[PDB]
């Protein structure tokens, strides 16, 4: 049965106005800005942007990839699909 989300988990993350997007739950570095309550730091592959999202917008990657893991015209998306599939735990700093 599912656990709560934890750093390192791979998802498609949904934001208003964008397609479900390959992403990971990030760690918060020592000294770094914490998310608001009930929110997770989401790192979007390809764009390499961070946003804070709750579980309603987080779809586990394994379950969702057949639906959401197809090329998209949007900037950074296809790079994002390569990242999540090929090196999802790398440093993208
Ligand atoms: C400015 C502000 N937010 C933006 N996005 C928020 C979600 C998004 C999906 C892929 O990367 C992150 C795009 C883009 N530009």
From Swiss-Prot:
Q: How does it assemble?
A: Interacts with HDGF. Interacts with trimethylated 'Lys-36' of histone H3 (H3K36me3). Interacts with trimethylated 'Lys-79' of histone H3 (H3K79me3), but has higher affinity for H3K36me3. Interacts with IWS1. Interacts with H2AX, POGZ, RBBP8 and CBX1. Interacts with histones H3K9me3, H3K27me3 and H3K36me2. Interacts with DPF3a (isoform 2 of DPF3/BAF45C). Interacts with SMARCA4/BRG1/BAF190A, SMARCC1/BAF155 and SMARCD1/BAF60A in a DPF3a-dependent manner.
Its family? Belongs to the HDGF family.
User: Superkingdom of this entry's organism?
Assistant: Eukaryota
Give a brief account of the tissues where this protein occurs. Answer: Widely expressed. High expression is found in heart, skeletal muscle, ovary and testis. Overexpression is frequently observed in hepatocellular carcinoma samples.
This one is known as Hepatoma-derived growth factor-related protein 2
Lineage, broadest ranks = Eukaryota, Metazoa, Chordata, Craniata, Vertebrata
Species name: Homo sapiens (Human)
Describe the location of the PWWP domain by residue ranges: 7-64
What is this protein's function? Answer: Acts as an epigenetic regulator of myogenesis in cooperation with DPF3a (isoform 2 of DPF3/BAF45C). Associates with the BAF complex via its interaction with DPF3a and HDGFL2-DPF3a activate myogenic genes by increasing chromatin accessibility through recruitment of SMARCA4/BRG1/BAF190A (ATPase subunit of the BAF complex) to myogenic gene promoters. Promotes the repair of DNA double-strand breaks (DSBs) through the homologous recombination pathway by facilitating the recruitment of the DNA endonuclease RBBP8 to the DSBs.
Q: Where in the cell is it found?
A: Nucleus; Cytoplasm
- Full protein: residues contained: 1 to 93 of 671
């Amino acid at each position: 049965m599912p656990h709560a989300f934890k750093p390192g988990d791979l998802v498609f993350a949904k934001m208003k106005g964008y397609p479900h997007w390959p992403a990971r739950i990030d760690d918060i570095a020592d000294g770094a800005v914490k998310p608001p309550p009930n929110k997770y730091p989401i790192f979007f592959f390809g764009t390499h942007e961070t946003a804070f999202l709750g579980p309603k917008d987080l779809f586990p990657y394994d379950k969702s990839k057949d639906k959401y893991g197809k090329p998209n015209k949007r900037k950074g998306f296809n790079e994002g699909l390569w990242e999540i599939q090929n090196n999802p735990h790398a440093s993208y700093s």
